[PDB]
Amino acid sequence: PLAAGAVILRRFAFNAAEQLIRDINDVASQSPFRQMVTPGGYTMSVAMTNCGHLGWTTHRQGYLYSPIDPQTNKPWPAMPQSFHNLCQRAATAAGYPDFQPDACLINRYAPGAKLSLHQDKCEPDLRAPIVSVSLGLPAIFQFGGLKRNDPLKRLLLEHGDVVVWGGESRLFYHGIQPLKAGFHPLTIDCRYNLTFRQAGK
DNA sequence: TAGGTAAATCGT
DNA sequence: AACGATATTACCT
Ligand SMILES: O=C(O)CCC(=O)C(=O)O
Numbered sequence: 001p002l003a004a005g006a007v008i009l010r011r012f013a014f015n016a017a018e019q020l021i022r023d024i025n026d027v028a029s030q031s032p033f034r035q036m037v038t039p040g041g042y043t044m045s046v047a048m049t050n051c052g053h054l055g056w057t058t059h060r061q062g063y064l065y066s067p068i069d070p071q072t073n074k075p076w077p078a079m080p081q082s083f084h085n086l087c088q089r090a091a092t093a094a095g096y097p098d099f100q101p102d103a104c105l106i107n108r109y110a111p112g113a114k115l116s117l118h119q120d121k122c123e124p125d126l127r128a129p130i131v132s133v134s135l136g137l138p139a140i141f142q143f144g145g146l147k148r149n150d151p152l153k154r155l156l157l158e159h160g161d162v163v164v165w166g167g168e169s170r171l172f173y174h175g176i177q178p179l180k181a182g183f184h185p186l187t188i189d190c191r192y193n194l195t196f197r198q199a200g201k
Numbered sequence: 202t203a204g205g206t207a208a209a210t211c212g213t
Numbered sequence: 214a215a216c217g218a219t220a221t222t223a224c225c226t
Pocket residue numbers: 105107115120132141174175176193195
């Protein structure tokens with residue numbers, strides 16, 4: 001197993017991928033992908049958007065979840081049923097049958113884009129797991145421990161892979177190494193990631 | 202207030 | 214390039 005309370009479900013979302021990508025395009029047509037600026041003033045290499053009741057955003061003051069897209073000043077698009085159903089099935093297979101996400105972050109990685117090591121730790125209810133779906137180009141996923149200097153596991157995530165963490169591993173450090181360039185028939189030149197969370201309640 | 206918080210980039 | 218430091222400091226609440 002990946003870790004205590006963590007599992008990788010390889011190719012779990014492979015069959016659902018084409019529909020998921022159609023719905024990514026639908027979400028992005030309403031709340032476009034954008035590269036967010038950190039409180040410290042650095043632009044993230046990942047381009048992102050959100051769907052569902054809450055969306056992850058940056059302010060000058062820190063990180064926060066908001067029901068409103070600060071770019072459009074409209075609510076984030078509703079979570080697609082394809083997203084919700086896939087998340088439910090993956091969470092159940094991973095041993096979290098009661099997971100009820102209210103937020104889905106959509107990350108887009110161009111070649112060279114990365115996500116430096118971090119914890120998912122601004123959700124008020126840490127009992128709920130993280131469900132993380134990979135689509136398109138492959139990436140090296142780092143999965144560590146509770147401390148930033150804890151040893152990292154390095155796992156290639158390929159199209160359709162789903163990673164779930166929670167319980168003992170809920171606050172584990174993780175990230176994505178700079179994306180290698182390449183081709184995938186469904187995303188062409190990028191990697192998408194769907195990150196489902198219970199961000200409120 | 203004065204204790205807590207810095208975490209993406211930079212250096213090795 | 215895989216790690217560690219970032220603070221023997223600035224910026225807040
Ligand atoms: O893209 C991934 O696989 C990781 C995404 C992630 O950790 C995040 O967006 O917080």
